[PDB]
A paper describes a structure:
Within Sulfolobales, member species encode for three types of T4P, namely the archaellum, the UV-inducible pilus system (Ups) and the archaeal adhesive pilus (Aap). Whereas the archaellum functions primarily in swimming motility, and the Ups in UV-induced cell aggregation and DNA-exchange, the Aap plays an important role in adhesion and twitching motility. Here, we determine the structure of the Aap, and show that it is solely composed of multiple copies of AapB. Each AapB subunit consists of an N-terminal α-helix tail, followed by a globular (head) domain.
Numbering used by the authors:
A (entry chain Z), B (entry chain Y), D (entry chain b), E (entry chain X), G (entry chain a): 16 to 156
C (entry chain U), F (entry chain T): 87 to 156
The structure:
């Protein structure tokens, strides 16, 4: 007598679980939309900031960043013209909804890159979303 | 003795329902074809079609539409420049195999659109077969 | 051995005129058969490709693409 | 005992349907080739072809068209200077492998076009194979 | 006492049948999971083989073919420029793991081709697995 | 400890030449074993990917991808 | 009682098989994800190697080739000016990570070339990966 009751319970539960899975599938997508929260807009600038040889060739990156997400997002790493770079201070963070000029100091990860006045160098800024925004920096130092 | 009888009933019912589900999966296929029956050809035209002191602005929209299905299909909604528009009157029907310049009247639902003479606007035409088609509309006046 | 029972072309059902072809087991063949529209009239265009579904005696249905040659 | 039987049925059906979908994906490919069968060669000519007091203006349009496919293809719509035009009469057919000067009659659908003698107009010719071709038409009178 | 023993019998039998179905599912994997395919490398050539004024047109098709699988595979059909062709004669077989220049004769299944010297035609070659490789064939005359 | 009972590579059966390798409990380790074609002579191309199903003593059949390197 | 235990068996087995398929998907990545390519740098040269009035025409082809990948790659065919050529002899192999001047002899697969001194001909060199590099070859005589 129990078999029919077990089958009934499993049928109804299967309906419920399938509907729950369907809803979860859609519930995923607003999370994934955060992968493109940030846009880097306008031409940035890179400037010599080394203090006449008193620092390990530390440069200044200024870029206008727009954040459309609901969370503050920070710059985790930067690559300039193929070369890795390391942020010298604490990472800048862009608040939600803002469009603002982020400025941060940077160091060569290896070697000593030489820049020419007025040249354009492509840099990829990697933000905490994992999003990598390409941008163009004009050297001004 | 009851349990074996119940198990027999449930086994046969499971066979029947599983076969029915498989056949339904096979039967779904023909309905998919109709999702692409229509394609919009070339640019279209928006025109201002409202009188002085009228309650509402109404725009005549003309687009060339090609239907490839067996059945007549009609427009259900249009979204121009991001704003959704509401279709006035009886929506035009596009005959089964014909290519026709179709014209229909729309009125803004979200807010007043500031169309500019001679400007080009992106739009999405949504047809009754559940198909959306990109289109480019020139505002003639 | 398996035989055709119906075909649906461009969302329109067609009836398999005549003795429906039978496909022998384990064999690859060119199969040709005549069909008539169950209702209405087709709007085929030369060179166009139409999605169809061919339904066989097991109830299984194979989707296919048919080009109209005129 | 029912669940294992149902699972067996569904597993085999899934194998069958997945293989069918893969074969359909492979079978779609030949239809893509026909989308580029036709190319328009050189400039064309528009001419005024309506009598006094007629209900409508009708323009003869002549264009050289080259067909490379196995099947005859015909014109379905034309869009001149942004305005869509409606093709009068039986649309001309372009034989499979031939290059021909084709002529057809059109009438304006959106509104009266103010063609200027000797002017050059951009147009898009839309053919029955779903292909659009840019063309340049000189208005001869 | 009967109910408990019957329920235990059905529980053990359900375990048996479920494990059998699971092992069947595991055994299906080798048949469906079959990597490797025939890859068509570079452009092939179509050459007119019809001779002596005989009634039937035959064309040589030469293509470079690389069988990445572990099984012998043969050509079953070809579609050129939207037109189907029949593989005249014993269809060529491509040995496993081998890259070969493969040449075979074809005849039009219907109609007549419109090939032009030096033109490039998109074709699809269908192999015994049902997979179909798109290729480009240049007509050499 | 669980052992490799049989292997199928790209649909073709294969036979282990030595004693079957055995994976101890809780371990993650590289199993390496010799194999022979059960029938025929399969030919592999450098850098190609071949799917193989390894059947373990549990009856579990794990699909995996092997890249030919010889 | 049988139904619940059978359902639990199938749930666990489904977890097992699904995770196995996911791991297979992860294992496919290295085979498909293969960066690096053979790059043809600058213009190459075609020189007439036919000598002694022998019946078969042979041409020297010299090109600068940079293998950016981690695998040895060889040429398989070349197409010059729309005409296929066969790589006479043991086809040259390009070692990994190396830039080399590569030279190989070719013969026309059909017909005869029409090369003119000083003319530049577009060619396509097909390598063992199936990738094909376009190049420009100058005929030096
Ligand atoms: C940005 O400004 C920097 C400072 O003007 C430039 O780098 C300096 O370049 C000079 C010559 O190229 C080099 O001598 C400096 O090096 C160091 O010198 C120190 C002594 S002193 O020169 O300061 O008196 C040493 O103590 C030290 O060990 C040396 O490494 C060098 N300075 C640094 C910090 O590298 C730089 O060229 C300029 N432009 C860019 C794009 O960076
Ligand atoms: C590939 O070769 C084919 C054979 O030469 C070409 O087809 C032939 O095309 C010519 C016209 O271009 C046509 O006259 C041939 O038709 C036959 O002609 C015979 C007499 S003769 O012409 O040989 O002197 C007749 O006896 C016969 O009844 C005709 O059918 C025609 N041949 C066929 C078999 O169709 C074809 O043009 C060429 N190119 C391509 C792209 O196929
Ligand atoms: C590259 O070199 C080729 C070989 O010298 C050139 O082809 C030769 O072209 C000449 C005419 O320009 C032609 O006469 C050759 O044909 C043969 O001639 C022999 C006699 S002799 O000419 O050597 O005195 C005959 O015995 C023989 O049967 C002919 O076939 C011809 N050679 C070949 C193999 O075709 C070619 O023009 C040159 N340039 C290019 C762009 O290929
Ligand atoms: C480079 O960026 C830094 C900010 O990180 C700027 O440094 C500031 O300089 C002003 C005076 O010019 C000081 O009052 C601030 O305290 C500095 N801030 C930090 C964090 O050091 C600098 O001005 C920028 N421009 C350069 C170096 O040319
Ligand atoms: C907009 O379209 C409407 C119909 O969709 C057109 O209305 C007709 O206009 C003509 C005169 O132009 C009248 O004779 C008809 O009685 C009107 N009604 C119908 C149902 O045809 C209108 O002309 C169009 N307006 C513009 C500016 O294009
Ligand atoms: C379309 O033309 C009509 C007039 O025929 C315009 O309607 C009125 O225009 C005046 C002046 O801008 C406004 O004060 C009224 O409010 C308008 N009426 C309505 C109902 O909007 C109308 O603005 C024109 N629309 C466009 C897009 O040009
Ligand atoms: C426009 O094209 C039409 C047909 O598409 C032409 O109509 C023919 O005109 C000639 C005289 O010019 C008559 O003898 C024929 O009876 C007409 N009909 C057909 C079907 O040929 C017309 O000539 C063209 N007009 C212009 C101005 O080019
Ligand atoms: C083409 O020529 C015809 C005359 O053969 C023109 O038709 C009439 O022209 C008068 C004067 O402009 C107008 O009042 C009528 O309304 C016109 N009739 C029609 C049906 O439009 C026509 O305008 C000419 N078209 C072009 C583009 O030149
Ligand atoms: C086309 O391919 C066929 C073979 O598939 C070639 O036919 C051979 O031609 C040679 C030369 O006359 C004969 O010795 C052989 O007996 C033929 N074999 C067959 C099977 O027909 C033909 O030469 C090829 N043509 C071209 C232009 O490549
Ligand atoms: C074309 O390349 C071939 C080699 O690929 C060269 O042939 C060599 O020629 C030299 C000089 O006569 C001989 O010593 C060698 O034995 C030849 N080797 C081979 C493999 O043929 C040929 O010289 C080159 N020609 C040009 C003009 O560069
Ligand atoms: C680097 O960052 C530190 C703080 O972390 C700051 O005091 C310093 O001025 C920055 N620049 C240099 C050249 O050290
Ligand atoms: C909207 O459409 C209806 C029916 O076609 C028509 O009667 C009405 O006049 C239209 N709106 C306006 C403002 O004219
Ligand atoms: C089917 O078509 C053929 C023509 O090829 C005709 O002879 C036959 O009568 C038709 N039969 C039916 C049932 O439509
Ligand atoms: C429109 O096309 C038809 C079909 O050829 C023709 O009879 C008719 O006259 C054309 N229109 C005019 C105004 O002549
Ligand atoms: C195929 O073509 C060859 C010509 O090379 C001819 O000898 C043979 O009879 C043809 N066979 C068929 C079935 O078309
Ligand atoms: C196969 O296994 C045996 C041991 O069973 C081993 O000695 C031998 O080297 C292996 N390979 C060959 C090629 O025999
Ligand atoms: C390739 O050309 C060379 C001439 O340098 C010749 O010795 C050799 O026999 C040719 N080989 C082939 C297969 O044509």
């Amino acid at each position: 007598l129990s078999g029919a009751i077990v089958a009934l319970i499993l049928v109804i539960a299967g309906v419920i679980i399938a509907i729950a899975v369907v809803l979860f599938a859609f519930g995923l997508i607003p999370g994934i939309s955060n992968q493109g929260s940030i846009q880097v807009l306008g031409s940035g600038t890179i400037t010599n900031s080394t203090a006449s040889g008193s620092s390990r060739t530390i440069y200044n990156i200024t870029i206008t960043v727009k954040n459309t997400g609901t969370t503050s997002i920070s710059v985790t790493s930067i690559n300039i013209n193929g070369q890795p770079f390391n942020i010298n201070g604490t990472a800048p963070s862009i608040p939600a909804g803002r469009t603002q000029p982020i400025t941060f100091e940077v160091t060569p990860a290896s070697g000593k890159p030489n820049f020419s006045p007025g040249a354009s160098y492509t840099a990829t800024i990697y933000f905490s979303n994992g999003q990598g925004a390409p941008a163009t920096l004009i050297y001004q130092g």
